[PDB]
Design a binder for this molecule. Sequence first.
Ligand SMILES: N[C@@H](CCC(=O)O)C(=O)O
Ligand SMILES: N[C@@H](CCC(=O)O)C(=O)O
Lengths: 186, 186, 342, 348
Amino acid sequence: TTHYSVADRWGNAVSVTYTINASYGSAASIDGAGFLLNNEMDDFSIKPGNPNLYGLVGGDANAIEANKRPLSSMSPTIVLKNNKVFLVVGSPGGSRIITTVLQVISNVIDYNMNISEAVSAPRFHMQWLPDELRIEKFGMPADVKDNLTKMGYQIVTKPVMGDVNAIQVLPKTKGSVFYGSTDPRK
Amino acid sequence: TTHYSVADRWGNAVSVTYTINASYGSAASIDGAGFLLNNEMDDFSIKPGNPNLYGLVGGDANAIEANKRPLSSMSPTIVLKNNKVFLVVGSPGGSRIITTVLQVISNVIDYNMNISEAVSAPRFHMQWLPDELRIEKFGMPADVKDNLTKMGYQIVTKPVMGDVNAIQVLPKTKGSVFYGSTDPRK
Amino acid sequence: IKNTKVGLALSSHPLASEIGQKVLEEGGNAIDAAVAIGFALAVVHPAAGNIGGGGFAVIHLANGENVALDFREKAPLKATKNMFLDKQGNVVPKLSEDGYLAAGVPGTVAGMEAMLKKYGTKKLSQLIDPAIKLAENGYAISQRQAETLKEARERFLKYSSSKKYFFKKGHLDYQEGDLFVQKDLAKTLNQIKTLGAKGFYQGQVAELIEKDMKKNGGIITKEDLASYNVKWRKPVVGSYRGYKIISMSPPSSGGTHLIQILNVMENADLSALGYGASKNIHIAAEAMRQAYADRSVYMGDADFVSVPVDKLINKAYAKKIFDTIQPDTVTPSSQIKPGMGQ
Amino acid sequence: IKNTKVGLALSSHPLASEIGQKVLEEGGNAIDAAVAIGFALAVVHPAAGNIGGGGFAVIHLANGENVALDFREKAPLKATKNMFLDKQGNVVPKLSEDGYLAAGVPGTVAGMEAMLKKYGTKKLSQLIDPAIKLAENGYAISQRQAETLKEARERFLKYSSSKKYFFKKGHLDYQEGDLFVQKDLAKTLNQIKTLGAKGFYQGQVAELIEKDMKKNGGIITKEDLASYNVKWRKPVVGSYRGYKIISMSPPSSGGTHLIQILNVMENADLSALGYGASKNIHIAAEAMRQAYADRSVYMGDADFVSVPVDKLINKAYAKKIFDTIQPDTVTPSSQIKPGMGQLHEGSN
Ligand SMILES: N[C@@H](CCC(=O)O)C(=O)O
Ligand SMILES: N[C@@H](CCC(=O)O)C(=O)O
């Protein structure tokens, strides 16, 4: 999965997340055509309660049916301020997309980080099952981990989450200024 | 102040910190010559107990004498591992140079950060007078601040400290790889 | 990264970002640039960028309209509920993950053409040229690409088609710095250049897809391809502390839960304690926990199932979640009730 | 940033870094590159890079030797203890900070030449060419430079020389993206190109310095410039968890306190709790507190006063400091004793 963000001088913004699901999709290509096929069918629930590639589970709502579109977690997002473009943001990461994107938005709005700071900041993740608080290397100091563990979290350090490409737009006396960040994770 | 670091293929390393003291030094230039004069005389103790530009104090040892060199905090440093160049590191920052440089070294050695991580990591600072623990914006979370405050630190958030240019040298199959980092604070 | 004249086009590959940025410099709009990037990434970032997959675009137009494009893959016409299970009702290992049966009907090419035709200003023929040049002439394998290719090796090895495209002669891994040329991909992109989306969903390319599927135990047919349809949908919309949030609606769960989680968080003054405070992490994590429990029961393609989006993004529901959050203890996942009673 | 061929030359300005890197590409050694960078930064980073200041170089040689070069400024020949005080013994505001009396005798040009002649391989005339080109033909003011220039405005405006050099016509602030050209600086660097350090410390440039000093109430003369001397010194050396630390000795306090504070920290297993743990911050911070108290009493130019470097960097002293650090609590600074009773030379 990969996300890209575009904003122009006329006030259009386009936030695109697209994918073949796994890295290199199904790993099978169309002979003669040179492209990899997706493995997007794994985003369905293939059996009630069966965890997919991202540990996500389902029942009736996300069961397979002919022509049905498998449930995604992709979250291409635009944030507006007074109806003008403010953020263009998104990320890959399967189940982690939702939490990655909201953390970047929160970092800007709640903590007044610029877009580079908001993207670089360590990320955590909770997805109900598994019942764990997923964190990143160097992302949480002992004091914070200790306090969260006391609350009843099971903290686990896992590979870095996401790959945010984000734009922040700020008005100027004349026009706007566009600020960008790619993700130090990849 | 500014620091630069050099490492070559023969195994030499050069770590240079140099300065005109304050930003633009004394602000006075030599007419006809095009260069700014330092204000390095402020690095002496000009009166016992008088705090200088970085809040540093002195008495007899660092009093002004003709031809004497004013005390510096500049810390251009080289670290060796098994007799081979490992780190070339240094920074500007007046009184904060010492603490900036040691934190980068500790980050690599104690915490196994790569040179980029080690340089980007938030820095703290204690210089005895003022009696305060100086930190950076977004550098320390509430839980850590609360515990340090309960120990007796007066925590103050101040502008970012330092501008580290550092090299890490690692053995590979044959010879060395040189990894560099400039400082995000620049 | 800063721009004060034409804006920014940002992706995970510098060659694709450069292509998008150039479209902006040459007077194209954000949609024009996005289309050029979508095709460029199909060449230079094959782990993820694609013409064989699908996705979503959320678009804010100059005139103030906000729209969403669904170019998500569809289950093929022959797909069935239990298609990945054996006779005894148990999952067939890797059947949904590796190989031709794991594929939905691709939507990317349809999506790129749809947004260009509705909102773009440049011709597809011109926007796709940079991608074709990269496929025909090649580009350098990056350090990370060499790693991800190496990791995919044993998967590629299962399929004669992928062994041909993603290895060097003798099925050898590409290495960092190698020039990667994709002649058949260029043929496919050239069909799209000349014929538009019909160059993928019909004609020679559709024939190649159908016949390779049949040979290899897949089920996508020309009928699937000819019937592939994008959908222009309303985005899901929320607010957070005076900002408007525009995100992807079903068949993504992403925008709904993003808005739901932020709605819960809105009840706390997070700014008070600042970034990385355990008390703030706790509120967010408990909101996440409920949202993902909700996802597992309520979420799917709304064209087929009832999805309570409006209920999930209702601030009153979020307040109810917030009020269950204990100062310094969690609600174990085993004790979460989807919808809480909704 | 990565290199597997000629190494790296890294500075705070990309134009200076590129100049250093090209020296490495062209076959020069780390000293050659460092000299090129020092002159380049004097053009492209005038807030900090300089020919009017001084500094230090710590050098590790291929053969295993470690050396330090002191090119720190000297107090002028006519400097005095109370030179910045009025008749009542009070500090004259800004006298040590703004203007011509605030200056020590510059060491940079002497330092550059000294390390080049002893350990370099290339000629100064060639290594200074890139800096001359940037002075003569100009370079683009960066965003940060525009900010720092603006902050210094009121200071520059006090001096006719700086008004000429660091403002555009009409004494306007330089803006981001403006091309900044330094003709007189170019002339100075050309004298150094032609004559070496003597092109700065003697002749026409020395005359310019003496004249402007006299005009403006400074005390540096041709004599001070002719007396300027670099000093080759032993670096301070220590160890931290098996790694060798090589850093700057007096007249810097930096290397000594760096080794001292790391020595204290070595007594704790910091890796156990990892980056940013309060327990780890406490040990380092309490070590810092004692080190800076020590600095205030025991540190100065060791050529002129007694400085107990060996005692300050001794692990046994650091172990004593470590022992005084009580778990979960600070020692207030008002209770800290410089030296901890360990640095008394009898009743001295
Ligand atoms: N196929 C997943 C994305 C997988 C990923 O981002 O790695 C989805 O649509 O939610
Ligand atoms: N003049 C100070 C350095 C000033 C700074 O780094 O800003 C010193 O030599 O320690």
